[PDB]
Design a protein around this nucleic acid. Structure first.
Ligand SMILES: [Mg+2]
Ligand SMILES: [Mg+2]
Ligand SMILES: [Mg+2]
Ligand SMILES: [Mg+2]
Ligand SMILES: [Mg+2]
Ligand SMILES: [Mg+2]
Ligand SMILES: [Mg+2]
Ligand SMILES: [Mg+2]
Ligand SMILES: [Mg+2]
Ligand SMILES: [Zn+2]
Lengths: 79, 134, 48, 174, 76, 119
RNA sequence: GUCAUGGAGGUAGAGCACUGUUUGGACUAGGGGCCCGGUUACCGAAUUCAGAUAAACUCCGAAUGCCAUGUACUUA
RNA sequence: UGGGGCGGUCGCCUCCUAAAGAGUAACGGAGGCGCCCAAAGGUUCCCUCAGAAUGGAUGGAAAUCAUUCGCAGAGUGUAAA
RNA sequence: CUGGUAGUUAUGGCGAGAAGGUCACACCCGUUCCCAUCCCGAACACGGUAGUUAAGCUUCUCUGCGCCAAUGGUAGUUGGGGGCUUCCCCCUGCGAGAGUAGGUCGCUGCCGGG
C-alpha cells in the first residue's frame, strides 16, 4: 500500500431513503456527513436513490405495469 | 499451362539428371501409368499438349493426375548478341524428369481406352516411355 | 548533427580525451569524470 | 467487509453440500477484480486520458496505472508507446467491499435494469461485465462528468468451469 | 548490364588447432561468428567470439548435451 | 480459473541463474542456503567432487533460538561457521540460493562472517 | 608413405522437422451469383489425409580429402 | 572490356557458386556501407516473446484488459549469414 | 521413508489414472515491524500454525505423443577398366537417409532428519 499517491478511503455507512435500508461499505467520497451505526461506525450518512431492495431485476418487483388483451379490449370497448 | 505464381529467385542453375527418380516410381492414385524410361526435360507446353490429347480421347470420363510440375525456369539470349554482360531473360518453365518416374495416371476407364490414351499422350513427349499397371 | 569533441582537464587544462556527441540532443558542454594521466587521479573533464 | 464473512460462513457450506467437493480448498472463490478503460480516442488530446485516470482513482480508491500501446497500427493513427487506457486491480478487502457496492447499489441504477447477461462467461469460470455509463456508480456526480464513457469490470474466480462460477455469483448476489 | 558483381573478402574462419595437440597459452583455437563451439575448461571467448587457450595443455574437442560442442585444454 | 505457480520452481530458475558464476571448489567451497517457512538450512559444498564438507540446520542437537526466527538464522550461521572452521575451511563463496540478500539469508551471512569464514 | 587412435568441417545422397514452390480429397471460417439466410463449386483463406520439389531449404548425412598423437613398419 | 567505341564498373561488408579444413575466377546470381546511440555503453536486481481462441465495448478484423494453448512461429538500431 | 544438493545426449521429456502425509516440505492466516508494488502484502519481505492433502511434491501403472535403436538390403562413393557419353556398365574396399525388430514412464553420489 504505497503512501501519498492514493485518494482517501474513509469508511461510510449507506442508507437507502426509499425504504430505510441500512448498509455499511466504505466509500471514497466524504459527502460531509456523520452518523454511527452497528455498535459504532461513525461515518457519513450517505443518502442514495433506490438500492437493490427495490430495483426490478435486483428485487422481486411484481408488475409496476399492466398487460393488454386487444381482442379483450375490443370486446370490452365495443361491448 | 502450369506456371508458378511466385519465385524467390528469377534465375536458376540448370542442374543435372543423374540416377533414378528419387520418388514417384510407383503408381499410387490411379491404376494406369506412363513411366519415363530415360531422363529428359519436360516443358509445360508439352505437358499441356499431352494432357489435352489424353483427356480428349476418353471423352472427359475418368480422372487424370499430373505427377510433375515445372518448377525450374530457363533463360535465353537473342540473336546477334555476344557472350558476356550478364545472364539472359527467363523464357519458360521445365520439369527435369529422371528415369523411372511416373508422370501421368488414369483411372475410371477400361484397359483399351486407357492404354490407347496413354499411347496417344506418349507421342507428345520427348522421352521414351512405357505403360504400367498398379 | 554528430561532431567530434575534445575533453580537457579542469585542473590541468590538458586535452586528454576525444569523443563524439549529438549537437541536437546534447547542445550543452559534456561533463565526465575521467582519469588524468598527469595527476594520476580522477578529475572532472569538460568539453572545449 | 461483511460480504466476505457471509461468503465464508454460509455460501461455503452450500457449495460444499451442493458440489460434493473432496477437500475444503477445492471450493471456488474470487481471486481479483480488474477494471479497464480505453482512451483510444485520446490519440490527439492527451487530457481526456488524464481525466479518466483521476476518475478511476476516485472511484476505486487506488490510482490506476496508465497503459501504453504495444503496437503502431496506422488504421487507428497509433504509434508504439502511446498511453492508452488504465487499470485498477483489487485484491482482498477492497475487492469484497467494491463488489458489494457494485451489486447492492451500483447495478440498481442502469437505465434499463432487466438483469445481467447469462452468457458472458469466457468458458473457464471468469465473468466479464460491461457497464458503459459513467455514474452508474453513485460516488461520482453529474456536474463533474465531462465525457460519458464506459468501463470493464472483470471478476476472476478460481472455479474450473462456468456453471459453478454461475452458482457462486448467484450465491453472492449477482 | 550486370547490376551484381560485388563480394567481400574471406575471413579465414575455422579451427586452428587439432584435437590432442599440445598448445601454448594464449593461442587461438577456433575462429567463428556467434557460438558454434562453446568455451570449455581453461579457454576463453574473445571479443569477436574467438576461442583461445588460457593455459598450456592438450586440446580436447568435447561434447555438451545433445546439440552443442565445447573445447577445453587439459594440462599434461 | 487461475494457474497459481509453484514458487519453488522459479526459485530453482533464479538459483540456476546464480550458479552460472558460483561453483565451489576444493580450495574455495560454496556455502549454500535453503529457506523454508518453518526454518533455515545451510550446507558447504564443493562441486568438483559433489560432496558436503559441513552442514547445519535449525534441527541440530541444541539449536537453541526462537526469537523471531531470525536469531535462529544467526545461530545457524555461527554454528555452521564453527563446524566448517573445525574441518579447516576458511575461504568460501556465499551462494545466494535464488533468494534476495535481505532478511534471514542476510542475517545468516553476517553471522557466518562474524566468525572465521572469509567471503 | 602406410597402419592404429582422436578430432573439426554439412558436399553426394536422402528428407519434409523450418522457409519458399506444388498436386489430389474432406471440411472448409467467406466472397460473388440462383435465390429464400439456404442453394454455394465460380472461386473458397486457416485445419487435416495422402503425394511431390529446391545453388542461395535442412530433423539427418557418407566416400574421400584435412589437422594432429604414436612408442608401429618402411623410406630420404 | 569475348576487337575498340557507347553503356556499366573501380574501396569496404554478408550469402550462393566453392566440389563436407583454409583458399578459389567470370561484364556469374542476390543485397548493403561512407552511419547511429549520453543510452541503444558499464554493473546489480528482476522477467519472457509472435499468434490464435473465448468474454465483454465506446472501438470495427485489428487499439486497452481477463483466462487458456503457445521452443521461439517474436525480438536482437541497420543488409545477410 | 523423506528433505536438501550435484553428475548423466529425453531410454531421463509430455500426457493419462491411483494413493500419501504438517516427521520434512506445502497450500494456508496476518501486515505492527525490515522490505515492496509505474496501482494491488498477487509477487518480494516479514510475523504465525486455525484448517486441508484440493494443487505442488512423493510413490505406483501405461507406449498415447515423444526419444533411443539394430541386422539385412539399397542410394552414394576412394582406386582400377570399359561403352552407343543429357549419361551408363563391371571389379575391389567403405557405406548411408527412410522403414523396421526392439527399448524406454530413468540411472548413479553426498549431507541432515525419520
Ligand atoms: Mg565472405
Ligand atoms: Mg563485447
Ligand atoms: Mg567491439
Ligand atoms: Mg541433391
Ligand atoms: Mg571450404
Ligand atoms: Mg573441399
Ligand atoms: Mg551499390
Ligand atoms: Mg542491445
Ligand atoms: Mg539407419
Ligand atoms: Zn589533470
Amino acid at each position: 500500500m504505497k503512501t501519498g499517491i492514493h485518494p482517501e478511503y474513509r469508511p461510510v455507512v449507506f442508507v437507502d431513503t426509499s425504504t430505510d435500508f441500512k448498509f455499511l461499505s466504505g466509500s471514497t467520497k466524504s459527502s460531509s456527513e456523520t452518523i454511527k451505526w452497528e455498535d459504532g461506525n461513525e461515518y457519513p450518512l450517505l443518502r442514495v436513490e433506490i438500492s437493490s431492495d427495490s430495483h426490478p431485476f435486483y428485487t422481486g418487483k411484481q408488475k409496476h405495469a399492466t398487460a393488454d388483451g386487444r381482442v379483450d379490449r375490443f370486446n370490452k370497448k365495443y361491448g | 499451362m502450369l506456371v508458378p505464381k511466385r519465385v524467390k529467385y528469377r534465375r536458376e542453375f540448370r542442374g543435372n539428371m543423374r540416377g533414378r527418380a528419387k520418388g514417384g516410381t510407383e503408381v499410387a492414385f490411379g491404376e494406369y501409368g506412363l513411366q519415363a524410361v530415360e531422363a529428359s526435360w519436360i516443358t509445360n507446353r508439352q505437358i499441356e499438349a499431352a494432357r489435352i490429347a489424353m483427356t480428349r480421347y476418353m471423352k472427359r470420363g475418368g480422372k487424370v493426375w499430373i505427377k510433375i510440375f515445372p518448377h525450374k525456369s530457363y533463360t535465353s539470349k537473342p540473336i546477334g548478341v555476344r557472350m558476356g554482360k550478364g545472364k539472359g531473360a527467363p523464357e519458360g518453365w521445365v520439369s527435369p524428369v529422371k528415369r523411372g518416374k511416373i508422370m501421368f495416371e488414369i483411372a475410371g476407364v477400361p484397359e483399351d481406352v486407357a492404354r490407347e490414351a496413354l499411347r496417344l499422350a506418349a507421342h507428345k513427349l520427348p522421352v521414351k516411355t512405357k505403360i504400367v499397371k498398379r | 548533427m554528430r561532431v567530434n569533441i575534445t575533453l580537457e582537464c579542469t585542473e590541468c587544462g590538458d586535452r586528454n580525451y576525444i569523443t563524439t556527441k549529438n549537437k541536437r540532443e546534447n547542445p550543452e558542454r559534456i561533463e565526465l569524470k575521467k582519469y588524468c594521466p598527469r595527476l594520476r587521479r580522477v578529475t572532472l573533464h569538460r568539453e572545449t | 467487509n461483511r460480504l466476505k464473512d457471509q461468503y465464508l460462513k454460509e455460501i461455503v457450506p452450500a457449495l460444499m453440500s451442493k458440489f460434493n467437493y473432496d477437500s475444503v480448498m477445492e471450493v471456488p472463490k474470487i481471486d481479483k477484480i480488474v477494471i479497464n478503460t480505453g482512451v483510444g480516442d485520446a490519440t490527439a488530446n492527451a487530457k481526456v486520458l488524464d481525466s479518466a485516470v483521476e476518475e478511476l482513482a476516485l472511484i476505486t480508491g487506488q490510482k490506476p496505472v496508465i497503459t501504453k500501446a504495444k503496437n503502431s497500427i496506422a488504421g487507428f493513427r497509433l504509434r508504439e508507446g502511446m498511453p492508452i487506457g488504465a487499470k485498477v486491480t483489487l485484491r482482498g478487502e477492497r475487492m469484497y467491499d467494491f463488489l458489494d457496492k457494485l451489486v447492492t447499489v451500483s447495478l440498481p441504477r442502469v437505465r434499463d435494469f432487466r438483469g445481467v447477461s447469462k452468457k458472458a462467461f469466457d468458458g473457464r469460470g471468469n465473468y466479464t461485465l460491461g457497464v458503459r455509463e459513467q455514474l452508474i456508480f453513485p460516488e461520482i456526480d453529474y456536474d463533474q462528468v465531462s465525457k460519458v464513457r464506459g468501463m470493464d469490470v472483470v471478476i476472476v474466480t478460481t472455479a474450473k468451469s462456468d456453471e459453478e462460477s454461475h452458482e457462486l455469483l448467484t450465491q453472492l448476489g449477482m | 548490364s550486370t547490376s551484381n558483381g560485388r563480394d567481400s573478402e574471406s575471413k579465414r574462419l575455422g579451427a586452428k588447432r587439432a584435437d590432442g595437440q599440445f598448445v601454448t597459452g594464449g593461442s587461438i583455437l577456433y575462429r567463428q561468428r556467434g557460438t558454434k563451439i562453446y568455451p570449455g575448461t581453461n579457454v576463453g571467448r574473445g571479443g569477436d567470439d574467438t576461442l583461445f587457450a588460457k593455459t598450456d595443455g592438450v586440446v580436447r574437442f568435447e561434447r555438451m548435451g545433445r546439440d552443442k560442442k565445447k573445447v577445453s585444454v587439459y594440462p599434461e | 480459473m487461475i494457474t497459481k505457480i509453484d514458487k519453488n520452481k522459479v526459485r530453482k530458475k533464479r538459483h540456476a541463474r546464480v550458479r552460472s558464476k558460483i561453483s565451489g571448489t576444493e580450495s574455495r567451497p560454496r556455502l549454500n542456503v535453503f529457506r523454508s517457512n518453518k526454518n533455515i538450512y545451510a550446507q558447504v559444498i564443493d562441486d568438483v567432487n559433489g560432496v558436503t564438507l559441513a552442514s547445519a540446520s535449525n534441527l541440530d542437537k541444541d539449536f537453541g533460538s526462537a526469537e523471531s526466527k531470525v536469531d535462529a538464522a544467526s545461530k545457524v550461521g555461527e554454528l555452521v561457521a564453527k563446524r566448517a572452521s573445525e574441518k579447516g575451511i576458511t575461504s568460501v563463496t556465499f551462494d545466494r540460493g535464488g533468494y534476495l540478500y535481505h532478511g534471514r539469508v542476510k542475517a545468516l551471512a553476517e553471522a557466518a562472517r562474524e566468525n572465521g569464514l572469509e567471503f
